[PDB]
Structures are given as C-alpha cells and as structure tokens.
C-alpha cells in the first residue's frame, strides 16, 4: 500500500562533557535501516537492515559525511536555542528533528515533512504546502525569519519531493522481501479469574507487521471502548509487533464478549470468543 | 538517503 521514509535526530547537551550526544536513525515504514551515534567508535553511518548492506562505499561515505554535518549543525543549534530562551549553560537540553516523505500505493509523492522540537515541544515545522513555516512561540519567530530569508523551504521541498521519494522507491525494491510484506497477526484469548464473580479476558495479537492494527471488544454486539484496557503496540524485537486488549467481565458471561482484530495482513477481520 | 543541506535554527 502506502509507504514512508523518515529520519529522526536527537541531540542532547551534556554540561561538563566535551561534546553533546547526537543520535540519528532512519526508517522505511516501521523498519529501521540505519543509525549513527556520535559517542560510538566508528563515527560512520551504520546499517541496521540487511537490505541496506547492499549499498556500496560511495553510499556509506556520503551518508557518513552528511550525518556528521547534521551532528555539527545540531551542536550549534543547542547553543543558539540556549540563547533564544536565555537559559544557563548548567542545564541539559534536547533538540529533535524529523523529516521524510510519504508515497501512495503508486509509489508517487504524497506528502513531505520537516519538524523540529526543543525540550520536548514543537518549535518549528514545515507546513503541508511545503512553502511556509509554523513557529510555536516567540523564540521560533527568529528561526522562521531566518529560514524565510534563506529560502530554506524552497531548497528543502526539492529533497522531499525528489530525492526522498526516489531513494524510498529504491529501498522498497531492494528490500522487497522485507518491506513489501505483511505478517498477519497470530491471535488468541486468555482467561484470568479476578474476584469471585469477575474474570479478565485478554485478546492477543502477535507477530504482526506493519504495526498498524485495531483491537476492539464487544459485549453482545456493542462496543466496549470505555471499559477496554489497551496497551501500546510494542516491538517483539524480531521485526514484528504485539498488542493486547482486555476487559473484566462477570463470571459466567464470558461467551457474551467478542474480540475483533483488524490488520492489513488479514483477508477479513477476525472475531474471537472465549471458549471453555 | 539523508538531506544534504541542513540549516541552523
């Protein structure tokens, strides 16, 4: 179906330390494929997906130089932001940046992004039209002014609509077996007595990909949205994800409830019901 | 592939 490529960058100042910590990671859909850690020994962009190891020396040297440049730019940003907010050099602060593109089922450009945050909150973001910026506060107005004067959006739009989508396509092809796959969830239900007149029913979805999934409980045909305990979708560690939803029901009424699982890996949604 | 030209805030 639709796909995306995204790069995430985190830079953390470390007062008393010689250099801040910079970590960059790249993803195609829900699969990470590269990483860089400024504290690491190699000082090079590293492969984290089998299909990216195919790229030659030219690719790696280029990605390494560009990521080291990113690191340097963010090292400067930390100081700049401390100034915009007139903060002390004594505290640790965080900068995060994310950019990438989305393509539709036809693998053609759908949307582009470039967002930035300081200390966990929105700072500045490129609007959907890829022509203007949204500044979160007064401080960010200086950056907005700076980026408008240097025509940043225009130069960036070219990457988002061109380079980004072109490499995403190349990755989707080179990593077909991995990226263009869907692993349908393996589902099952567990029963756990609670009180003496109550029991917990837990619906499980395991080993699925992509991460997008919908688990819902119903009691005699009606949604139990409010009374459903749902956990965040979590990584199994092997490239697939997991999730569960639970409801507490009166003993002897378990059969009245049904769990519904929706995932693109399923030809049709599944319905599970407790079976003694 | 990473963006090449990045601008400071």
């Amino acid at each position, epitope marked *: 179906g639709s796909h995306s490529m995204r790069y995430f960058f985190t830079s953390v100042s470390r007062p008393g330390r010689g250099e801040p910590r910079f970590i960059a990671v790249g993803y195609v859909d829900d699969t990470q494929f590269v990483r860089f850690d400024s504290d690491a020994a190699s000082q090079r962009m590293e492969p984290r997906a089998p299909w990216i190891e195919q790229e030659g020396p030219e690719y790696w040297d*280029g990605e390494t130089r560009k990521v*080291k*440049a990113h690191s340097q730019t963010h090292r400067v940003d930390l100081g700049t932001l401390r100034g915009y907010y007139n903060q002390s050099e004594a505290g640790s602060h965080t900068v995060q940046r994310m950019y990438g593109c989305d393509v539709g089922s036809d693998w053609r450009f759908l949307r582009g992004y470039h967002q930035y945050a300081y200390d966990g909150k929105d700072y500045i973001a490129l609007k959907e039209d890829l022509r203007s910026w949204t500044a979160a506060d007064m401080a960010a107005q200086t950056t907005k002014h700076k980026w408008e004067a240097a025509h940043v959006a225009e130069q960036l739009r*070219a990457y988002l609509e061109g380079t980004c989508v072109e490499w995403l396509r190349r990755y989707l092809e080179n990593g077909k077996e991995t990226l263009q796959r869907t692993d349908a969830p393996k589902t099952h239900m567990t029963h756990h007595a609670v009180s003496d007149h109550e029991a917990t029913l837990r619906c499980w979805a395991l080993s699925f990909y992509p991460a997008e999934i919908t688990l819902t409980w119903q009691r005699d045909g009606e949604d139990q949205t409010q009374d459903t305990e749902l956990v965040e979708t979590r990584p199994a560690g092997d490239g697939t994800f997991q999730k569960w939803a639970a409801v507490v029901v009166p003993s002897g009424q378990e059969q009245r409830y049904t769990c519904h699982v929706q995932h693109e890996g399923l030809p049709k949604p599944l319905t599970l019901r407790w079976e003694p | 592939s990473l963006l*090449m*030209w990045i*601008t400071q805030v």
Partner: T-cell receptor
Amino acid sequence: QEVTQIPAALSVPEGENLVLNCSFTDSAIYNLQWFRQDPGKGLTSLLLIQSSQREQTSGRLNASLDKSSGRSTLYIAASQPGDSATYLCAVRPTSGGSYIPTFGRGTSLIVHP
Amino acid sequence: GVTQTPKFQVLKTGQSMTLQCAQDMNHEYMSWYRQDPGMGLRLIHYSVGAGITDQGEVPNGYNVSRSTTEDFPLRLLSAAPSQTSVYFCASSYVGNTGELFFGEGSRLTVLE
C-alpha cells in the same frame, strides 16, 4: 561537474556595460557564486545566487542563473578601471555529501581608463 | 569573518609549519586551497564538522585536524619547494545560502 568561463579574457573601455559568462555541466547545484580576484590579492565575493532563485543585484553588479540551461551571466554596468580583475564563478552540489565547490578558471577583465 | 595566519612565511626545505584558519560564524564547513599559475584553485583538505576531515584534490604533503568548530589548521610536516604557493582557507554553512567565505590568503615560499 565542469565549470567553464568563455571568453577567458575581456578588454573594455571605461563606461561600457559588460557581460561575463559562466557554464556548468551538471544542473543539480545548490548555489552559484561569483568572485573577483586581483593579482597578488585574495578572493572577494560579489554575488551568491541560490539554485531556487533567478537573480541577484549589488550596485552595478547583477547576475542571472539559468539552472536548466546550465549557465549564469554576470552583468557589470558602467564599468570602471577598478573593476579590472579576474572574475571566478563557482557552484556547489545539491547532493553527493562532499559539499565541495567546483570553480571555473575565471575571466580576466581589463577596463581601460 | 575568516582569519588566517601568517600572511607571509619563508621556510627552508624540511621545516614544518602550520597555517591557521579561524572563523567566528559557526560555519560547519571549512577547507584549504592552494592557488598556483596555470593550475587554478586546488582543494587540499576539507571538513564538514568537528571530528571529521577528508582529502581534496591535492592532499599529499599536508595534514589537517578539526578538533573545534572555529579552527581548521593546515600543517606541513616537512616543507618541500613544490609547496611554495598561496594558500586560502574557505568556510561556509552546510545549509542556508551556502555562501563561501575566503580568508585573506597566506603566501609561503619554501627554499633549499
């Protein structure tokens, strides 16, 4: 990947409006910069045109960029003896990861008093 | 701006020396060039940030280091007559307009 400046030499009477040419083989550039250098001296930046833009002006100097045609033109109005120097044109790559500029060999200009 | 020193220097063959280049614009990119008659400007070494340096067109005989954001020293461990030239340091952002800023130049003559 190759920047050329032809004519490589130009002689003009004071007061005339002149035109200096720049050509590059790869249109994927981030910007184009014009400089002037006098013998025994350093390089002074004149104009910088970003690849998304069309032209830049500074006093009697005006330059245009035609990225699709792989060319740039530097115009100097009402030339003066002091404009005499070697004008260099350079471009930087949009991609690649080196950020290394490519310079033309320049056009030597002499404006006769 | 960009400040490079010394402006003039004489060296005997085999002597070592370092040309300094400092910039206070927070530029990530810094580089060194040598310019000689009929050769144009040739890139020696460059750096896109602290802790990274790469070879240019004519790296042989020169060494650089980028321990800090502001400085990009060019060192000649053992000066040779072929290194007599005019050296230019150039810096810029790795974004924004990407404008290059050249230092004033350093003239070096290496004699036997």
